[PDB]
Amino acid sequence: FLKKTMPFKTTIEGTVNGHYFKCTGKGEGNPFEGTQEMKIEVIEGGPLPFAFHILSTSC
Amino acid sequence: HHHGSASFLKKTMPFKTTIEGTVNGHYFKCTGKGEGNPFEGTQEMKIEVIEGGPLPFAFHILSTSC
Amino acid sequence: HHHGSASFLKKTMPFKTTIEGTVNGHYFKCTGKGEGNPFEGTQEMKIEVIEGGPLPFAFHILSTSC
Amino acid sequence: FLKKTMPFKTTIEGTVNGHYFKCTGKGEGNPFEGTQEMKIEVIEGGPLPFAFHILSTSC
Amino acid sequence: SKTFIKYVSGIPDYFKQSFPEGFTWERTTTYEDGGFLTAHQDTSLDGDCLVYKVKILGNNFPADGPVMQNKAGRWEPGTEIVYEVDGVLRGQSLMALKCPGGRHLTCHLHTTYRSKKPASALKMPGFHFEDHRIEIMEEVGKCYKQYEAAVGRYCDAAPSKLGHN
Amino acid sequence: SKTFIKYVSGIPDYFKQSFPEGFTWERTTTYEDGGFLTAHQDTSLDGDCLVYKVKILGNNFPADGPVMQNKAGRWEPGTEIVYEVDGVLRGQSLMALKCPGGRHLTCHLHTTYRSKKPASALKMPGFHFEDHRIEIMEEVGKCYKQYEAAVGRYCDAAPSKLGHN
Amino acid sequence: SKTFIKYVSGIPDYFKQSFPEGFTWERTTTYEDGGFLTAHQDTSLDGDCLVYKVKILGNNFPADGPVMQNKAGRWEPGTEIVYEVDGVLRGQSLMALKCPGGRHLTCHLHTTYRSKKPASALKMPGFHFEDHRIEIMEEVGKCYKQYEAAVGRYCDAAPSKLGHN
Amino acid sequence: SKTFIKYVSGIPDYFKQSFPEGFTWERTTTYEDGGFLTAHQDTSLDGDCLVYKVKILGNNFPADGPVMQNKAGRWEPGTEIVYEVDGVLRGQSLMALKCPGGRHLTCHLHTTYRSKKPASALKMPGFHFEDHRIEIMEEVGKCYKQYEAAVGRYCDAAPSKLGHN
Numbered sequence: 001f002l003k004k005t006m007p008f009k010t011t012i013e014g015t016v017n018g019h020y021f022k023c024t025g026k027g028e029g030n031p032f033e034g035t036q037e038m039k040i041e042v043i044e045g046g047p048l049p050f051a052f053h054i055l056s057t058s059c
Numbered sequence: 060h061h062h063g064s065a066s067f068l069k070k071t072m073p074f075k076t077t078i079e080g081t082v083n084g085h086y087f088k089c090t091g092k093g094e095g096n097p098f099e100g101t102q103e104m105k106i107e108v109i110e111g112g113p114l115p116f117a118f119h120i121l122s123t124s125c
Numbered sequence: 126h127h128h129g130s131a132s133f134l135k136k137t138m139p140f141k142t143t144i145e146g147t148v149n150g151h152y153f154k155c156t157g158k159g160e161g162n163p164f165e166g167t168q169e170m171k172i173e174v175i176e177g178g179p180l181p182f183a184f185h186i187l188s189t190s191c
Numbered sequence: 192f193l194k195k196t197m198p199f200k201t202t203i204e205g206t207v208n209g210h211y212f213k214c215t216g217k218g219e220g221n222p223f224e225g226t227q228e229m230k231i232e233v234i235e236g237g238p239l240p241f242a243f244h245i246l247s248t249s250c
Numbered sequence: 251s252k253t254f255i256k257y258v259s260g261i262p263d264y265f266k267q268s269f270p271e272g273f274t275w276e277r278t279t280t281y282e283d284g285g286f287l288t289a290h291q292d293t294s295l296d297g298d299c300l301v302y303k304v305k306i307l308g309n310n311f312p313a314d315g316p317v318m319q320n321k322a323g324r325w326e327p328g329t330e331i332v333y334e335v336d337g338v339l340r341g342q343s344l345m346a347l348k349c350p351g352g353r354h355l356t357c358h359l360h361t362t363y364r365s366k367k368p369a370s371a372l373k374m375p376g377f378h379f380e381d382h383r384i385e386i387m388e389e390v391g392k393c394y395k396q397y398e399a400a401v402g403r404y405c406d407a408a409p410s411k412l413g414h415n
Numbered sequence: 416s417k418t419f420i421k422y423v424s425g426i427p428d429y430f431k432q433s434f435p436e437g438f439t440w441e442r443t444t445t446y447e448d449g450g451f452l453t454a455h456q457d458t459s460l461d462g463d464c465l466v467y468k469v470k471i472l473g474n475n476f477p478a479d480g481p482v483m484q485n486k487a488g489r490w491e492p493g494t495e496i497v498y499e500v501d502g503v504l505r506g507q508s509l510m511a512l513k514c515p516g517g518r519h520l521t522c523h524l525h526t527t528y529r530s531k532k533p534a535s536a537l538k539m540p541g542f543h544f545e546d547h548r549i550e551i552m553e554e555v556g557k558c559y560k561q562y563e564a565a566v567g568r569y570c571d572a573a574p575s576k577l578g579h580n
Numbered sequence: 581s582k583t584f585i586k587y588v589s590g591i592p593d594y595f596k597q598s599f600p601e602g603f604t605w606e607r608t609t610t611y612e613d614g615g616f617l618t619a620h621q622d623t624s625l626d627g628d629c630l631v632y633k634v635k636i637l638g639n640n641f642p643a644d645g646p647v648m649q650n651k652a653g654r655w656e657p658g659t660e661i662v663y664e665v666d667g668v669l670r671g672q673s674l675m676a677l678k679c680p681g682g683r684h685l686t687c688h689l690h691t692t693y694r695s696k697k698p699a700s701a702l703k704m705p706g707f708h709f710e711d712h713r714i715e716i717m718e719e720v721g722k723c724y725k726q727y728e729a730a731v732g733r734y735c736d737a738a739p740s741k742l743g744h745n
Numbered sequence: 746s747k748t749f750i751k752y753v754s755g756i757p758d759y760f761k762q763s764f765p766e767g768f769t770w771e772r773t774t775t776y777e778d779g780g781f782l783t784a785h786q787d788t789s790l791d792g793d794c795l796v797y798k799v800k801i802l803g804n805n806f807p808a809d810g811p812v813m814q815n816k817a818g819r820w821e822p823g824t825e826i827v828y829e830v831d832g833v834l835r836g837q838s839l840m841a842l843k844c845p846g847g848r849h850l851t852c853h854l855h856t857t858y859r860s861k862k863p864a865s866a867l868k869m870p871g872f873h874f875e876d877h878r879i880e881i882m883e884e885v886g887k888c889y890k891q892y893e894a895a896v897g898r899y900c901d902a903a904p905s906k907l908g909h910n
Binding site: 654656657658659661663665672673674676678683684686688707709711712713715717727729730731733734735737738739740741742744 | 819821822823824826828830837838839841843848849851853872874876877878880882892894895896898899900902903904905906907909
């Protein structure tokens with residue numbers, strides 16, 4: 001069921017300090033090697049008025 | 060100033076609520092309907108859980124939100 | 126019950142304080158002398174810094190201790 | 192001024208939940224290798240009514 | 251539900267001044283046993299009807315605590331400090347659950363209230379207190395009746411010797 | 416200096432009941448900008464004279480904050496929640512410095528009060544509030560005059576519809 | 581995205597063991613300057629594709645802080661402690677933003693990880709550490725590329741003299 | 746006892762550089778169940794002997810908790826983040842007690858380290874990690890033997906793709 005390289009995709013919906021946003025993302029990683037990379041796109045509420053960094057551990 | 064006397068203030072105002080949430084993994088939705096007295100500072104409402112009921116946690120954690 | 130009336134209560138009570146501390150590396154010592162009204166809930170005191178003065182921080186952080 | 196093995200000594204005085212105590216300790220370690228060991232003696236307020244563990248990062 | 255507050259001593263009413271546009275609020279409540287309850291809320295006015303839309307995320311509640319055991323008792327009354335920051339209002343307060351066994355479990359509320367009017371169209375209140383009492387008057391796990399009374403005030407019980415509020 | 420409290424509504428007075436032996440208290444105050452102020456205090460009675468012995472450790476105050484800059488303004492009044500735990504009293508409260516620029520810096524007090532009488536010789540109060548107002552009435556960095564008024568009460572401003580305190 | 585972790589020393593993998601059912605996680609991050617970021621996430625496996633659904637509520641970020649000024653810089657690496665509580669996993673960690681200029685803003689992460697398998701079906705890991713490095717590889721307010729590397733381990737760097745992990 | 750640290754990757758040693766003047770440290774540790782442990786420490790060098798003077802104030806430990814029940818078990822290893830703030834070093838870390846039974850009680854350490862040299866005299870380290878393992882080697886309530894190993898490092902385990910430490 002897992003594989004040495006796997007893709008993933010994300011949807012994120014949120015409010016931060018009253019500002020609504022939505023993102024989608026797509027990435028891929030090596031689960032057993034512990035590395036991954038993705039692209040995150042803000043599809044609603046962009047450009048974000050807050051630092052993306054607060055979303056890093058969620059995306 | 061300006062409203063003259065309490066006879067000119069709205070005595071009661073109704074309100075309705077929709078609540079959607081997840082608590083410890085548990086999804087739920089509520090509706091509510093209430094009324095209050097804006098200048099006397101009092102209010103009461105009924106809250107109905109319409110999805111995710113019966114709630115698996117104390118309603119109390121929702122008291123300040125509802 | 127039992128004390129009858131306020132005429133039988135102590136009206137004022139004196140107090141004295143010694144304070145020793147370090148704040149952000151800064152050592153200091155204070156003494157204080159005050160008086161209060163135990164049942165009226167009021168009090169006032171004078172606090173003197175006897176070592177480490179003039180204090181290099183706001184006295185306010187000592188207010189609830191003195 | 193430092194050395195590959197160095198001794199140290201400690202005095203600790205405290206109050207925890209209204210209980211007064213005093214300790215002394217003696218130990219030795221290798222500062223550049225990052226290892227050390229000591230013995231801590233409670234000289235006042237012993238036997239401590241609280242877990243010594245809360246003093247570990249202080250002694 | 252901050253439209254329903256009795257303000258005394260001439261304290262300006264941020265919430266009532268914000269209509270007809272309304273206001274939002276946001277809060278994280280931290281419980282002393284590890285739980286967190288986060289909410290975002292929108293308050294609007296449609297004709298005569300106040301409309302509340304609430305989003306909630308709660309987490310980290312201990313499985314054996316009174317919240318997840320649904321043995322929470324009743325809230326004690328409480329008092330919030332309310333004050334302006336950066337042209338919005340901050341609130342903070344401590345609340346306590348009185349569990350059926352008589353012990354208490356406390357929590358700390360951290361709130362921001364955001365008018366939909368610009369701060370320039372508002373008379374901001376100074377630092378003050380908002381007292382509340384919340385009572386779950388009946389559990390008619392699916393239907394609840396809740397009452398609240400709230401008062402906005404300065405500290406009259408312990409007055410200033412200098413004329414401060 | 417908890418011997419000086421006006422208690423209303425028949426709330427038992429833990430502090431006055433503790434004499435002639437006295438009581439201790441212990442507290443950590445956490446400031447929102449990183450500072451901590453910790454204290455231990457002993458309260459004794461020698462004849463008619465109340466004797467306070469205080470130990471303080473403060474740390475992590477930011478160099479550019481109002482405490483280390485000695486630009487702290489004045490405290491606002493506040494309200495403590497006070498309640499029994501394990502046969503002692505716990506207190507918690509939020510306090511706020513009003514800096515000379517008009518902004519506020521908050522802190523959270525976490526206290527335990529310990530009678531030197533056994534709990535068995537004491538009438539413990541139920542959950543209640545202690546209001547305070549502390550004023551630095553004069554700076555005569557070496558000599559200060561401070562006043563405090565304190566009231567112990569239930570929540571009368573927002574009463575119960577059920578008869579709870 | 582906890583499926584991507586290199587575990588050493590035989591530590592069981594709570595996340596990989598959860599498939600094909602998947603798992604959730606929930607977190608509140610508390611920032612030292614008052615902000616809070618809460619999230620709930622669902623992880624599922626749809627064929628060969630990991631699917632993440634995330635809900636976010638952030639609040640109380642100061643208007644003048646790095647987050648709202650969109651001057652947050654980059655995250656430092658960090659280390660999470662991960663351990664079993666009741667029958668799920670708790671995590672906690674400290675993270676630090678390195679703001680442009682070189683100064684740091686810290687926060688505290690409080691997490692629960694919940695397998696959708698019964699923990700009777702799972703080999704639970706003992707207390708261990710999860711190191712991470714998150715990097716914003718490209719700011720392509722609207723399009724970001726982000727990298728993470730993570731390792732689950734014991735404390736190899738400072739060995740036990742007593743047989744412990 | 747921060748003189749005893751093995752630093753790698755050329756990280757400057759704030760503590761060893763402080764001699765012969767020495768340094769102080771100050772800390773508050775916040776326990777998840779309400780306890781607080783605050784300490785101030787002075788480190789000096791008297792000939793060939795390091796001399797430590799420590800002052801401690803602990804409070805609010807629950808009577809029913811592991812600390813006051815003297816059932817605390819052992820500390821897990823941990824990792825401190827250490828970084829410059831104003832011109833001194835800040836540290837923060839999470840520690841966990843493994844109680845007898847295998848369950849954990851966590852706490853948060855908040856530290857400032859202060860050289861007695863002017864920081865103009867010092868090579869300041871950038872943001873880095875300090876791993877520790879503290880072990881009670883012998884309980885000989887009155888006589889303890891304690892070991893510590895510590896390493897100061899960057900995040901080697903999860904390397905940067907961007908040139909960063």
